[PDB]
Design a protein around this ligand. Structure first.
Ligand SMILES: [Ca+2]
Ligand SMILES: [Ca+2]
Ligand SMILES: [Cl-]
Ligand code: NA
Length: 307
């Protein structure tokens, strides 16, 4: 598996920080930091950083913010082939923070994703992107019916499909597609939401999900597939005490391991290494992900146990 196609979100993340003491409910002097984000987009960048040939299809506006996302794609080596709607704005997450980093309030405009309908997913151009790929990844930013239709296409094309849950609210959108998803990445809350730690595999398999990863807190992770499950040990003294992030990094490291054909025990430890790299300091980010950095962090990752 060399080529991964991602179908999911890619938004602008704009963060405004107040420069002085906060005046609540009023104007404050500040300055804006912008960067690209979105579960699918972040995972796409990560997979590219880990050596895969990655392409992404995300709903995109005809604006400069969309071009900022496109540029961040190119910087990470991701082929950006957007579903462009020239009259519309690229989705955005805008936060205003106090000088001390406290979140005052954030506004998400994600409506553009509603345009990615099953009808649009079914166009020849998207099917050909799928046929050109070796592995698919989606996220639950896409509409529910689109996710189900995507599952049917993956089936018909015999393409492996992975999914990122994004949030407990969004996870439920994956319910009909479950039987067509080879690996679903989620945390504790998203698992409860879609389903109704070593227990997740049998609960989830009867829900029709043949494999996935569920994370809990800083240090517990379960991975499963059609016949197997594995779990992470608590860290020893010398070992890394946080192996969980936003979710992109775990997914990317795990999926990278599976796509290279490693065991779920090995995939578990790689995903953990990848997550740990992104959270090992206040300043750590997924830009620090590479095959070499994962290789370097792996010796610090607790052992995994098949069950
Ligand atoms: Ca200023
Ligand atoms: Ca189904
Ligand atoms: Cl997102
Ligand atoms: Na964490």
């Amino acid at each position: 598996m060399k080529k991964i196609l991602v179908l999911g979100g890619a938004h602008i993340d704009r963060r405004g920080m107040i420069e002085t003491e906060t005046a609540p409910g009023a104007s404050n002097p500040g300055s804006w930091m912008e960067e690209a984000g979105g579960g699918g987009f972040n995972a796409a960048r990560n997979l590219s950083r880990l050596g895969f040939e990655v392409r992404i299809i995300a709903p995109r506006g005809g604006d400069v913010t969309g071009e900022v996302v496109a540029e961040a794609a190119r910087q990470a080596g991701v082929e950006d082939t957007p579903f462009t709607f020239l009259d519309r704005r690229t989705p955005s997450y805008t936060a205003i923070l106090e000088r001390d980093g406290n979140l005052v309030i954030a506004l998400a405009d994600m409506d553009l994703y509603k345009l990615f309908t099953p009808r649009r997913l079914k166009v020849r151009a998207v099917r050909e992107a799928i046929i050109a790929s070796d592995f698919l990844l989606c996220d639950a930013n896409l509409p529910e019916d689109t996710l189900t239709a995507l599952g049917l296409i993956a089936r018909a094309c015999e393409k492996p499909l992975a999914a990122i849950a994004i949030s407990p609210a969004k996870a439920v959108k994956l319910k009909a597609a479950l039987g067509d998803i080879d690996i679903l990445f989620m945390n504790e809350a998203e698992a409860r939401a879609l389903t109704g730690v070593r227990d997740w595999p049998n609960i989830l398999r009867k829900a029709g999900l043949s494999g996935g990863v569920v994370t809990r807190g800083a240090s517990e992770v379960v991975a499963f597939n059609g016949t197997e499950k594995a779990i992470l040990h608590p860290p020893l003294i010398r070992e890394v005490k946080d192996v969980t992030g936003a979710g992109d990094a775990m997914a990317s490291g795990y999926l990278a391991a599976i796509a290279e054909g490693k065991t779920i025990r090995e995939a578990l430890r790689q995903g953990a290494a990848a997550a740990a790299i992104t959270v090992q300091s206040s300043f750590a980010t997924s830009q620090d992900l590479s095959k070499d950095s994962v290789e370097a962090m792996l010796g610090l990752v607790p052992q995994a146990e098949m069950l």
